[PDB]
From Swiss-Prot:
Localization, UniProt: Secreted
Subunit annotation: Monomer.
Protein name: Lysozyme C
Coiled coil segments of this chain: none
Protein source organism: Homo sapiens (Human)
Amino acid sequence: KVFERCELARTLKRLGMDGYRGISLANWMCLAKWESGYNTRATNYNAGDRSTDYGIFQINSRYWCNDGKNPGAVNACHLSCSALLQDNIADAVACAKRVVRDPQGIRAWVAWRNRCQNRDVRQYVQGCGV
Ligand SMILES: [Cl-]
């Protein structure tokens, strides 16, 4: 499913992401924008290591979910990757909290460093009143 920006922002809002481990709603949104366009079914094959990034937050399969492919990957969020392609985004988000529980936090996403760090993020929340 494709969210309207502010729908997402408020849903994340409702699910406890604002300020979770220090990350504001706005950061999460910028992240979401560059990684998925607010689309739960977004995929990406990483030709580099054959991994595959899933859903609205483009969680990677090598370490965060299980998709059956690489027999040496880990699934730290203990969910099938497919549960990251659905309309309800609680799993995504939970898994998203777990990744930002790593010490690097949201800087684990490359797109967050290139697109949001030390840049304008309010924009992604402007008018959502969250
Ligand atoms: Cl993988």
